[PDB]
Amino acid sequence: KETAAAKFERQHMDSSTSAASSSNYCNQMMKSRNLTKDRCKPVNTFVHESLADVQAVCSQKNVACKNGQTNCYQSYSTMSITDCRETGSSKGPNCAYKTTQANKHIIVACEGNPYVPVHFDASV
């Protein structure tokens, strides 16, 4: 099975662009990253920064996690991101997503050795 670190990269990293290119970005990306396999993942955020920049967040601002955990970190600077949210009439096997691009700090949960991102908690 996929490691937590690898799953985080597949689900949340997109260093190939600098921002959601169009309104169909999420429809394409959620498919390409295999997040629409057996169900449409309802919500997912892609970060448009280098993997190195996102991994660096694990040494940045230590904050509590939504779930009350303490291995969360908030990026010191804002980053380009794209939030993908499934929309109402979305059923299957065709998933429909609304694409919302923004520049915000990200909060990720980290763990392991190396100490890398394993979950995307939120963006502020």
Side-chain angles (χ1 to χ4, degrees):
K1 64 146 51 191
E2 188 174 41
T3 64
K7 183 179 176 178
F8 175 95
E9 302 173 336
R10 176 177 60 85
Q11 289 191 153
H12 304 296
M13 296 296 307
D14 177 15
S15 318
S16 224
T17 46
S18 46
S21 318
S22 53
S23 61
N24 198 243
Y25 174 84
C26 287
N27 286 342
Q28 179 262 120
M29 284 296 295
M30 295 299 284
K31 184 187 303 69
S32 287
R33 295 308 182 84
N34 302 326
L35 310 187
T36 66
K37 291 277 282 60
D38 301 321
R39 175 196 49 66
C40 306
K41 187 172 151 63
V43 42
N44 191 67
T45 302
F46 287 108
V47 182
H48 311 290
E49 300 298 345
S50 73
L51 176 64
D53 276 7
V54 174
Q55 286 172 154
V57 177
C58 296
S59 298
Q60 293 177 23
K61 195 66 171 191
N62 185 215
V63 299
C65 298
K66 238 77 50 277
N67 72 351
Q69 276 268 215
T70 65
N71 61 322
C72 274
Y73 293 85
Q74 182 167 142
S75 65
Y76 296 145
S77 75
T78 66
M79 303 181 174
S80 169
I81 64 179
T82 298
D83 179 66
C84 295
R85 287 256 171 183
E86 183 183 15
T87 39
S89 74
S90 184
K91 268 42 246 51
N94 298 288
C95 306
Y97 291 93
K98 165 181 169 64
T99 300
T100 304
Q101 203 282 320
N103 288 273
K104 299 129 56 55
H105 306 267
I106 63 168
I107 300 174
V108 296
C110 304
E111 69 134 73
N113 210 309
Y115 197 63
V116 300
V118 293
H119 191 70
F120 190 87
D121 257 54
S123 64
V124 180

